[PDB]
Amino acid sequence: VTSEQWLYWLHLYFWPLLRVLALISTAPILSERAIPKRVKLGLGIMITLVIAPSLPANDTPLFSIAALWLAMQQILIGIALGFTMQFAFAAVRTAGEFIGLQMGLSFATFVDPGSHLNMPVLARIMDMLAMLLFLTFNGHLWLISLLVDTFHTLPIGSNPVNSNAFMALARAGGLIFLNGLMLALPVITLLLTLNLALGLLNRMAPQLSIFVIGFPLTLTVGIMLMAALMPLIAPFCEHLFSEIFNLLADIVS
Amino acid sequence: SQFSEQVNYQRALEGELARTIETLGPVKSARVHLAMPKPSLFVREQKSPSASVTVTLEPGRALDEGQISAVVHLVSSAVAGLPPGNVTLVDQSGHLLT
Amino acid sequence: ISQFSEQVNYQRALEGELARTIETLGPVKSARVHLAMPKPSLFVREQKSPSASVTVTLEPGRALDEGQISAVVHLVSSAVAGLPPGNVTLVDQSGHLLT
Amino acid sequence: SEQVNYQRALEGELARTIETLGPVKSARVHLAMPKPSLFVREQKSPSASVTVTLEPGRALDEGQISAVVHLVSSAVAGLPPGNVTLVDQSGHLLT
Amino acid sequence: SEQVNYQRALEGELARTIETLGPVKSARVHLAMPKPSLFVREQKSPSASVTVTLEPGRALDEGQISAVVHLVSSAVAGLPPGNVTLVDQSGHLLT
Amino acid sequence: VGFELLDQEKFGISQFSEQVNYQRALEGELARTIETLGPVKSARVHLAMPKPSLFVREQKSPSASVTVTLEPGRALDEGQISAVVHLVSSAVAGLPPGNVTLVDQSGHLLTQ
Amino acid sequence: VGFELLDQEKFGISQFSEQVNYQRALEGELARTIETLGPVKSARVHLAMPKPSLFVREQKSPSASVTVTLEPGRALDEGQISAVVHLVSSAVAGLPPGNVTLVDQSGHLLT
Amino acid sequence: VGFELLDQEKFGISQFSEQVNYQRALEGELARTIETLGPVKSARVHLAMPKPSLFVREQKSPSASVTVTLEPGRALDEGQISAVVHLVSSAVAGLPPGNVTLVDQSGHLLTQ
Amino acid sequence: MTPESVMMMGTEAMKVALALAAPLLLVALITGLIISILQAATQINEMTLSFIPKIVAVFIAIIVAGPWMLNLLLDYVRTLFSNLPYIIG
Amino acid sequence: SWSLSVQTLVFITSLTFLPAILLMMTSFTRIIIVFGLLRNALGTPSAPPNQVLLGLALFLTFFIMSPVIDKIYVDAYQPFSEQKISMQEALDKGAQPLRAFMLRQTREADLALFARLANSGPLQGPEAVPMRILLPAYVTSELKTAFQIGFTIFIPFLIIDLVIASVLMALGMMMVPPATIALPFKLMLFVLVDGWQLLMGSLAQSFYS
Amino acid sequence: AIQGIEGVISQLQATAMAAVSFAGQLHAALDRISDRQAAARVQAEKFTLGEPGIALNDVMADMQKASVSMQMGIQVRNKLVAAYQEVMSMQV
């Protein structure tokens, strides 16, 4: 009596904690530095407390290279999930920064690339709008649910792994660009026409145009254009989230 | 869009399969419908794709048992991971040939 | 074309082709297919099975055989990812449920 | 807007097929597609109201009532038949 | 604005179908849809008021009142029939 | 005017302007239906939508005042008074009937 | 004297303006309906809607003053005084009837 | 003055100006109605609307001064004086009647 | 809470930004266009004389309409902070 | 009941978890996240020093959790101190008002998700929810609410920078940093519209609503 | 509660259809230690009372055992607190 076998409880509560905390430190909104560290650790601990008793406990000792392989596996799974989720916000940031750069908002990058003078304020605006939308669509709950679900697909125990699968996540790097182009497209094109229009004005009497009349007009036009274009991101926001989620579901397995 | 690309690919495969099925002696026209499985935002699960094939035969040109077999094989092979048992073949009168 | 628009358009196209093949069937003069594809939610376990409603208009007196009803069922079910046959309803031009 | 429009288009097509039924001269379909609540004891579910105008004296068969029910229920993701109401031009509940 | 417009469109179509019903010459539907809450307690059920003008002497049958109730309730996500009031052109509550 | 005023295609200065327009339109349509009724020649509906406190979870509810002008001698029925009450209460999210006042052209309170 | 009356004033309107304009419009419509009451020839409504203060342990409530001019000899009925009270109180969010004062053209308090 | 005063509003209007203008307008309309009462030939209303604070030791409630000019010999009734008090008090958010002073053209205090 | 409310939040915010920035940008654009057309008429071309009146015009713009912008933005922020506890989810 | 040595041991051990109670079961998380986000918004990452914000958050939490603490004291601590309720029952009695406070502010979606993840049976009413389900549901709801509040807080401070950059760009001053100009204006805004009274009142209402 | 009994019958129906923990273990250990200590104390009070049959040997040995059990509980608490502090110190 008075056994309280500690190794069994430790091995039951450790690896799910490692995977949950690995997701927490990288998953969007759950990985933002504004949350105190203890809150994140407690959330991981409580989620593991809820989940672990149902799972089959592992018996590999913590003092073995098998434990290191397990820890590497959990870290890989968590960071892969969090990063694949982060790709959508990367795409939204790209689209916003490009709309802002076609605004002429930061012209110093065309002359001094990476010269400590850059303000992608539109990128930040649409990034926080995307975060608000993600909060509204309860994406984080889904993330937690999928973190739990990847066990049935991929159990804690060391399992063999595949290859092109990693490419898929890396190939998801294309989406950030590909979807970004579309969001812009609904505005950059008209901005392009505006610039074309300015060109027609410069084909008249030489000089006396551009850098004096083009910038304010194009700034105001970009502002009101994409202010009107704001209602458009939400369907595209859901499209981006669905793309990331089903890509994750297909490739994680 | 990728989704548009995927729809186009599905349509093209359907077309070519129907084409080869018609070229066959007893078959006057063919219609192939493919159901490729789908992804989920949660939970692992494969849904072996499925196919429905409708054939119109030449007046009285009944298809041989071997013919049903060969149609089955062709359609199954043309679809990545299509389990034959998920191919349905039907005639112009609504008789299930498979 | 929005992501939603892209889907709705796919649904419409599938409906059209299915009706087309159903009509080509001898006894069938015209067909109408309605698909209800469902939604995944973070408050349920098994997603609800898709459903289909098929209305057929027959040629004067061309009653559909039990096998004709069956084959229609099979085709419609297969054309919809994860469509459980039992969720396919087949009805004639007079409102008789054939399934 | 995109959703509401989806609703209008669906309602329209359903009414269309219902009219294309011999005894039916015109149909009107109203869908109530809402958001559900878990662990609220008895929640509720999507619902439909169907009004049919019949041809002079063209009474709908019990089977006809059944087939209308099936079609409307299937066309709405997760529509429990029992939440489909069918009514005639005189206000008689057919379901 | 998008919501208010949706509400007024739903009201319009419902009145439309109600007038279709033979005995009804014109209908007027007012919907009261309340604020939604995604917490674990706050919730309220919507309400409807329906005024009908009948054709000279065209009294609505009991079944008719029942069918109007069903249609209006179904057209409003989570509308409990008991919160639908039906009134005639003289101010008689048919409910 | 009601929804017509909203359909004047006029810039909504702000959400507050939108809310005022919505309140007016509802008032208009309600008055309209009330007049449509036989004994009523003209109706006037005033809605008071309430406002929340600061730190008080204690809550209140909206109120309505309805003035009717009747046709010469067309006295409203008790049932009539009841139906007017029901309609106005339903048309206002969370309007407790008891907060609907109905008055005639002579200043007689037809409700309680 | 008109809802649409203040429904313009160009723009650059500090919300303060938006509120004051609402108050004026409500006053106008209320006076209007009060005039409609047969015995009433003209009405004048003044609203005092307090701007919320987080200084008092609880929120204070608004007040109304109603002046009516009657038709020659058209004295208002008790029930009439009651109906005016009800209408004015309802038209003002959280207006406690007891804070509605009704006065005639001669300065007699009817409330 | 009064409501008309707040019409030609230049864009440059400080909140302070906004408020002062509101005070002026209220004063004007109140004087107007007070003239409507028969015995009154002209009225003048002065409002003192100040800061609130919280220390119960030093609270200064809003105050009003009303000067009336009467028609030759048209003395105001006690009830009249009461009605003037009520109207002015109601028109000012949180105006305690006891802080309304009513005076005639000869300098007689009609209130208290 | 609903995405419609969020996107409305962004729209109204960025329309407030547009209203705040439109007078200054429009004044600068008008001054630049006027100076450019005068240069074209007079056949004078130096890229620096168009920069001079623009600063003066834009700085006068704050003199004339500055209080209006300051009152509009404060009202927006005040209303947003007051309505913050009612759009919580 | 337990021996006095066991009771003292349990009391001393339970005194350890006070930061955990403050962080995971109390109103502290939302306030601290909102304060951190606001500090990130104004452009002064070291302005109110962390200790000042922590003290303000502690006082706000003490003022907000007052009715819950009062109910715990009147229902659990008072009978326990008067030897009417045992030590192992005072905890159970006092965990109920805190559970109710955590429930009201939580969200259905989180509750449904964590009811599904535990493979628990159907929960027809809120009275069947255990603490093992309510704890992380409450934590997630608080995190989401805090982030929503902070992200609607962030908007005006980015609007000002946007308009500042656009105005600077109209005149061709493309090499002027916009952040340095915008920071004094952001401070001026946060001074003008009662930057802290409005935020304090909004947070307090956000709890009591 | 009436609704509580409704919930009990609902869980019984759930069991029909279908057809301890670390905190529980710690509570059990605390209860066992307290029960042993109370038994030793009660026997000591009975001996001090003068009631027949209670031997000083048994009293003293039981007090010894109770002291050892208390010390074991104290050590377990100390370690457990140390492990909790170690876990909470982890940087995420």
Side-chain angles (χ1 to χ4, degrees):
Chain A
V1 294
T2 326
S3 78
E4 267 162 47
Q5 175 76 301
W6 329 79
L7 286 205
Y8 163 74
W9 287 78
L10 167 60
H11 291 304
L12 174 76
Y13 280 166
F14 201 91
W15 319 103
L17 176 68
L18 253 175
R19 217 189 266 192
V20 171
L21 279 179
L23 175 78
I24 280 190
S25 176
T26 312
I29 295 104
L30 301 167
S31 160
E32 151 175 6
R33 319 134 301 270
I35 305 176
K37 288 185 222 175
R38 294 162 95 74
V39 180
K40 290 182 230 181
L41 184 72
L43 194 34
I45 279 293
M46 278 159 7
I47 291 180
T48 283
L49 260 200
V50 175
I51 287 313
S54 82
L55 306 180
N58 216 4
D59 46 7
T60 171
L62 258 168
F63 273 86
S64 173
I65 319 292
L68 182 60
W69 169 231
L70 259 64
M72 192 194 317
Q73 175 200 350
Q74 270 88 42
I75 297 288
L76 292 196
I77 297 306
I79 69 165
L81 295 157
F83 222 80
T84 322
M85 203 46 255
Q86 184 94 20
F87 279 161
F89 298 123
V92 173
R93 266 199 182 239
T94 278
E97 191 284 359
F98 274 89
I99 293 180
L101 213 51
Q102 268 265 338
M103 291 285 258
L105 265 199
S106 176
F107 208 85
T109 88
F110 306 149
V111 289
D112 308 286
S115 184
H116 216 179
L117 186 77
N118 85 49
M119 281 273 100
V121 51
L122 272 92
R124 297 149 79 81
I125 275 144
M126 321 176 19
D127 185 34
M128 271 146 277
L129 259 300
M131 311 275 178
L132 272 169
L133 279 164
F134 186 74
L135 265 41
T136 302
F137 289 129
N138 272 305
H140 43 280
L141 297 185
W142 298 355
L143 260 192
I144 305 200
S145 159
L146 205 63
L147 162 55
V148 160
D149 285 345
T150 62
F151 284 121
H152 306 303
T153 89
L154 302 185
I156 288 278
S158 66
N159 302 302
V161 292
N162 310 356
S163 74
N164 195 39
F166 288 132
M167 299 284 167
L169 266 85
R171 282 175 192 147
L175 277 303
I176 317 144
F177 298 114
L178 152 74
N179 319 303
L181 167 58
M182 261 54 225
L183 207 44
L185 215 79
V187 55
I188 278 194
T189 310
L190 192 143
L191 282 168
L192 194 83
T193 67
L194 186 31
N195 264 341
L196 261 55
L198 311 193
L200 330 178
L201 276 290
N202 204 3
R203 209 184 148 289
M204 267 153 266
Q207 309 108 39
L208 330 180
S209 319
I210 272 291
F211 249 81
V212 303
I213 178 174
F215 270 140
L217 198 160
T218 198
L219 276 155
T220 325
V221 165
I223 276 179
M224 47 57 93
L225 247 174
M226 72 54 55
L229 191 83
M230 301 265 258
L232 188 140
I233 39 184
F236 188 55
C237 160
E238 199 185 355
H239 165 49
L240 266 198
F241 292 168
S242 47
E243 266 184 297
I244 280 310
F245 271 129
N246 51 12
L247 156 67
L248 253 202
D250 162 63
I251 279 306
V252 158
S253 70
Chain B
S1 173
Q2 188 179 1
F3 176 61
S4 310
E5 164 270 303
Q6 248 311 119
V7 170
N8 297 359
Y9 170 61
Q10 169 171 0
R11 294 188 76 294
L13 195 60
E14 282 163 354
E16 314 312 298
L17 293 196
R19 287 183 172 63
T20 303
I21 299 178
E22 307 151 1
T23 68
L24 290 176
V27 183
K28 179 174 180 170
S29 59
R31 184 61 182 181
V32 183
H33 290 300
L34 298 180
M36 276 175 214
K38 54 186 308 187
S40 173
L41 296 331
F42 14 61
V43 165
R44 43 134 300 118
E45 251 304 298
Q46 51 81 59
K47 313 87 185 296
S48 292
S50 54
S52 190
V53 184
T54 306
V55 292
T56 303
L57 306 180
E58 286 296 353
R61 311 281 189 177
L63 279 192
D64 334 354
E65 172 190 0
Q67 202 141 14
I68 308 161
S69 312
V71 166
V72 168
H73 298 309
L74 179 79
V75 179
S76 67
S77 64
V79 177
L82 180 60
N86 288 1
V87 186
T88 53
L89 182 64
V90 186
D91 66 356
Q92 68 277 4
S93 37
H95 304 98
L96 184 72
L97 301 184
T98 41
Chain C
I1 35 187
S2 170
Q3 181 266 358
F4 187 60
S5 311
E6 211 80 299
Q7 174 61 62
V8 171
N9 296 359
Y10 183 55
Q11 168 162 358
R12 294 188 77 294
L14 195 60
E15 282 163 354
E17 314 312 298
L18 293 196
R20 287 183 172 63
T21 303
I22 299 178
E23 303 184 1
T24 71
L25 291 200
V28 183
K29 179 174 180 170
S30 59
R32 183 61 182 181
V33 183
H34 289 300
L35 298 180
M37 283 204 346
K39 300 96 178 183
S41 45
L42 206 72
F43 88 120
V44 75
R45 306 95 45 243
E46 58 172 61
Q47 228 43 63
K48 313 136 198 308
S49 308
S51 54
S53 190
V54 185
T55 306
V56 293
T57 303
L58 306 180
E59 286 296 353
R62 311 281 189 177
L64 279 192
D65 191 297
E66 184 173 359
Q68 287 174 2
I69 301 169
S70 313
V72 166
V73 168
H74 298 309
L75 179 79
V76 179
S77 67
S78 64
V80 177
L83 180 59
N87 288 1
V88 186
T89 53
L90 182 64
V91 186
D92 317 71
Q93 68 277 4
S94 36
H96 304 98
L97 184 72
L98 301 184
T99 40
Chain D
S1 311
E2 211 80 299
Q3 174 60 62
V4 171
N5 296 359
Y6 166 63
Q7 176 179 0
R8 163 239 171 180
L10 184 59
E11 282 163 354
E13 314 312 298
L14 294 196
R16 287 183 172 63
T17 303
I18 299 178
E19 307 152 1
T20 75
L21 282 202
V24 183
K25 179 174 180 170
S26 59
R28 183 61 182 181
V29 183
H30 290 299
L31 298 180
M33 293 184 286
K35 189 180 297 176
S37 177
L38 175 136
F39 128 107
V40 67
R41 297 166 169 116
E42 11 77 57
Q43 29 271 356
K44 37 70 258 307
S45 298
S47 54
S49 190
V50 184
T51 306
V52 292
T53 303
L54 306 180
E55 286 296 353
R58 311 281 189 177
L60 279 192
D61 192 3
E62 172 190 0
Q64 286 169 7
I65 304 171
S66 309
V68 166
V69 169
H70 298 309
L71 179 79
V72 179
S73 67
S74 64
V76 177
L79 180 60
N83 288 1
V84 186
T85 53
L86 182 64
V87 186
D88 66 0
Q89 68 277 4
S90 37
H92 304 98
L93 184 72
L94 301 184
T95 40
Chain E
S1 310
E2 211 80 299
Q3 174 60 62
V4 171
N5 296 359
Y6 183 55
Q7 168 162 358
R8 108 159 178 237
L10 195 61
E11 282 163 354
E13 314 312 298
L14 293 196
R16 195 169 311 178
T17 303
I18 299 178
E19 307 151 1
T20 81
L21 297 196
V24 183
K25 179 174 180 170
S26 59
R28 183 60 182 182
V29 183
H30 290 300
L31 298 180
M33 262 175 325
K35 47 199 312 176
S37 302
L38 306 96
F39 290 117
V40 287
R41 274 278 69 64
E42 5 283 358
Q43 264 311 300
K44 307 171 184 179
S45 303
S47 54
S49 190
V50 185
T51 306
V52 293
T53 303
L54 306 180
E55 286 296 353
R58 311 281 189 177
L60 279 192
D61 55 285
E62 175 181 59
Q64 200 141 14
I65 309 168
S66 309
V68 166
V69 169
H70 298 309
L71 179 79
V72 179
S73 67
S74 64
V76 177
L79 180 59
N83 288 1
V84 186
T85 53
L86 182 64
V87 186
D88 66 359
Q89 68 277 4
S90 37
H92 304 98
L93 184 72
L94 310 190
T95 335
Chain F
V1 270
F3 298 121
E4 186 257 62
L5 110 93
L6 175 70
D7 284 301
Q8 295 176 302
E9 305 171 301
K10 180 87 285 300
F11 164 58
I13 309 290
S14 176
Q15 188 179 1
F16 176 61
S17 309
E18 164 270 302
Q19 248 311 119
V20 170
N21 297 359
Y22 170 61
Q23 169 171 0
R24 297 163 83 295
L26 195 60
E27 282 163 355
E29 314 312 298
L30 293 196
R32 287 183 172 62
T33 303
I34 299 178
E35 307 152 1
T36 72
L37 296 205
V40 183
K41 179 174 180 170
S42 59
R44 184 61 182 181
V45 183
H46 290 299
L47 298 180
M49 279 149 208
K51 177 181 301 180
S53 62
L54 270 319
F55 298 112
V56 189
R57 17 169 298 181
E58 168 253 294
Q59 64 168 59
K60 21 204 149 303
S61 302
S63 54
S65 190
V66 185
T67 306
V68 292
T69 303
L70 306 180
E71 286 296 353
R74 311 281 189 177
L76 279 192
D77 229 13
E78 172 190 0
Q80 238 147 4
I81 304 170
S82 309
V84 166
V85 169
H86 298 309
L87 179 79
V88 179
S89 67
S90 64
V92 177
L95 180 59
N99 288 1
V100 186
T101 53
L102 182 64
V103 186
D104 66 358
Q105 68 277 4
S106 37
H108 304 98
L109 184 72
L110 301 184
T111 51
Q112 314 174 2
Chain G
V1 272
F3 232 119
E4 301 286 355
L5 179 87
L6 308 102
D7 286 359
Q8 186 72 186
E9 209 70 2
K10 273 63 196 304
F11 40 60
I13 33 184
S14 166
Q15 207 274 354
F16 163 66
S17 310
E18 211 80 299
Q19 174 60 62
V20 171
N21 296 359
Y22 190 66
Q23 168 162 358
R24 293 164 88 299
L26 195 60
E27 282 163 354
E29 314 312 298
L30 293 196
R32 167 260 207 65
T33 303
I34 299 178
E35 300 151 3
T36 74
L37 297 200
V40 183
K41 179 174 180 170
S42 59
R44 183 61 182 181
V45 183
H46 289 300
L47 298 180
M49 269 168 330
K51 188 98 295 180
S53 60
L54 286 77
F55 291 113
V56 41
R57 56 185 167 242
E58 54 210 61
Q59 203 93 300
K60 307 179 181 301
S61 292
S63 54
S65 190
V66 185
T67 306
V68 292
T69 303
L70 306 180
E71 286 296 353
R74 311 281 189 177
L76 279 192
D77 188 297
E78 172 190 0
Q80 301 176 1
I81 306 170
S82 309
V84 167
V85 168
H86 298 309
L87 179 79
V88 180
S89 67
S90 64
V92 177
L95 180 60
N99 288 1
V100 186
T101 53
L102 182 64
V103 186
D104 67 359
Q105 68 277 4
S106 36
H108 304 98
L109 184 72
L110 317 182
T111 41
Chain H
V1 283
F3 294 130
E4 180 254 60
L5 161 83
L6 283 83
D7 287 359
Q8 299 80 3
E9 302 176 359
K10 61 179 180 182
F11 293 119
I13 36 184
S14 170
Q15 188 179 1
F16 175 62
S17 310
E18 265 84 303
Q19 174 60 62
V20 171
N21 296 359
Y22 182 55
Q23 168 162 358
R24 294 162 94 293
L26 195 60
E27 282 163 354
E29 314 312 298
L30 293 196
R32 287 183 172 63
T33 303
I34 299 178
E35 303 191 1
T36 74
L37 299 196
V40 183
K41 179 174 180 170
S42 59
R44 184 61 182 181
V45 183
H46 290 300
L47 298 180
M49 293 184 287
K51 312 83 49 268
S53 83
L54 72 314
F55 300 118
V56 292
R57 293 186 49 242
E58 288 303 300
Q59 295 294 299
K60 290 78 184 303
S61 304
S63 54
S65 190
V66 184
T67 306
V68 292
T69 303
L70 306 180
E71 286 296 353
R74 311 281 189 177
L76 279 192
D77 298 59
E78 172 190 0
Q80 273 166 357
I81 301 171
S82 309
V84 166
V85 168
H86 298 309
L87 179 79
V88 179
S89 67
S90 64
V92 177
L95 180 59
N99 288 1
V100 186
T101 53
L102 182 64
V103 186
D104 69 357
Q105 68 277 4
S106 37
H108 304 98
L109 184 72
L110 301 184
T111 45
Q112 285 176 0
Chain I
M1 302 136 298
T2 178
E4 294 118 320
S5 54
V6 152
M7 277 324 311
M8 160 168 82
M9 135 159 225
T11 306
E12 181 76 350
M14 178 132 179
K15 300 199 88 171
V16 152
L18 172 43
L20 219 71
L24 306 158
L25 292 160
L26 276 158
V27 162
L29 157 77
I30 295 323
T31 284
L33 152 67
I34 288 290
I35 272 296
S36 176
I37 178 178
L38 271 166
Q39 277 160 118
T42 293
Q43 263 170 42
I44 283 304
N45 42 358
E46 288 313 309
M47 281 335 288
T48 203
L49 59 100
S50 181
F51 299 155
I52 280 312
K54 238 193 226 187
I55 287 137
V56 183
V58 80
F59 275 159
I60 288 315
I62 296 99
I63 324 299
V64 280
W68 173 76
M69 321 213 177
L70 195 65
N71 290 31
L72 169 92
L73 179 57
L74 301 193
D75 286 345
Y76 165 47
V77 164
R78 211 171 299 192
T79 309
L80 179 79
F81 284 21
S82 179
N83 224 26
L84 181 52
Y86 302 144
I87 319 179
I88 36 161
Chain J
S1 176
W2 291 323
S3 175
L4 184 50
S5 314
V6 176
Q7 283 178 357
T8 297
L9 182 129
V10 168
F11 185 68
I12 281 315
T13 312
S14 94
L15 273 180
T16 290
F17 310 121
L18 261 283
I21 297 177
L22 182 77
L23 286 164
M24 287 150 230
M25 264 170 266
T26 325
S27 47
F28 187 65
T29 303
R30 190 184 310 154
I31 288 144
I32 214 75
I33 292 184
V34 161
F35 281 161
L37 279 169
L38 163 75
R39 204 169 78 190
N40 246 356
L42 281 167
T44 59
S46 97
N50 294 339
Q51 281 93 50
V52 169
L53 296 175
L54 279 166
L56 225 40
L58 263 285
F59 273 117
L60 222 65
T61 290
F62 163 63
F63 291 149
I64 285 191
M65 289 273 279
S66 86
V68 179
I69 297 168
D70 280 354
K71 176 152 222 163
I72 287 176
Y73 171 80
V74 68
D75 285 5
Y77 216 67
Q78 186 79 241
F80 166 70
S81 211
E82 291 226 353
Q83 273 146 291
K84 289 146 116 185
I85 274 179
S86 77
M87 153 85 77
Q88 43 204 20
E89 199 52 51
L91 317 184
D92 265 352
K93 270 285 301 171
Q96 291 192 356
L98 183 73
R99 170 158 94 73
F101 160 74
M102 280 179 38
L103 195 63
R104 176 190 172 182
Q105 311 273 8
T106 194
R107 188 182 311 115
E108 279 269 3
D110 324 300
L111 279 170
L113 165 77
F114 282 76
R116 170 202 331 177
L117 293 188
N119 309 148
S120 80
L123 310 164
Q124 258 184 352
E127 316 172 356
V129 162
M131 198 75 166
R132 94 182 71 111
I133 298 183
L134 181 54
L135 275 186
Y138 166 77
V139 169
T140 311
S141 309
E142 278 263 338
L143 248 58
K144 184 173 135 179
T145 319
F147 278 131
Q148 282 187 354
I149 288 182
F151 275 164
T152 88
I153 272 283
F154 250 105
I155 278 286
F157 307 112
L158 305 168
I159 286 187
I160 285 144
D161 192 19
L162 187 37
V163 313
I164 282 291
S166 294
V167 167
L168 282 167
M169 201 85 208
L171 310 170
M173 305 184 235
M174 57 187 210
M175 293 266 297
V176 152
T180 66
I181 282 177
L183 169 64
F185 285 100
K186 266 154 24 172
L187 292 168
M188 143 210 86
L189 152 64
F190 207 60
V191 152
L192 289 187
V193 284
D194 330 354
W196 308 91
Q197 294 82 1
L198 281 193
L199 172 75
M200 279 332 149
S202 156
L203 223 36
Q205 291 175 60
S206 166
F207 279 97
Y208 292 121
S209 199
Chain K
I2 309 176
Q3 199 49 241
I5 298 180
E6 198 291 302
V8 172
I9 77 98
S10 173
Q11 299 170 241
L12 256 64
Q13 105 98 299
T15 305
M17 152 199 340
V20 197
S21 54
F22 204 60
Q25 288 181 344
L26 290 173
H27 196 173
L30 292 177
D31 273 28
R32 257 189 315 179
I33 287 181
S34 165
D35 265 2
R36 206 184 265 187
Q37 247 205 340
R41 183 200 48 169
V42 160
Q43 171 151 241
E45 97 156 315
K46 247 179 259 209
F47 182 81
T48 318
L49 227 47
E51 141 178 13
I54 295 322
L56 179 67
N57 318 280
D58 303 341
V59 172
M60 272 329 280
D62 297 334
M63 195 84 45
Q64 189 195 18
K65 286 187 217 178
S67 164
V68 173
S69 189
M70 191 36 48
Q71 276 277 8
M72 191 145 188
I74 287 170
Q75 232 52 45
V76 167
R77 172 211 67 131
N78 283 2
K79 254 302 310 310
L80 261 280
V81 152
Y84 169 91
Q85 293 284 80
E86 183 53 271
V87 175
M88 294 316 264
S89 58
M90 165 178 324
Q91 292 177 335
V92 202

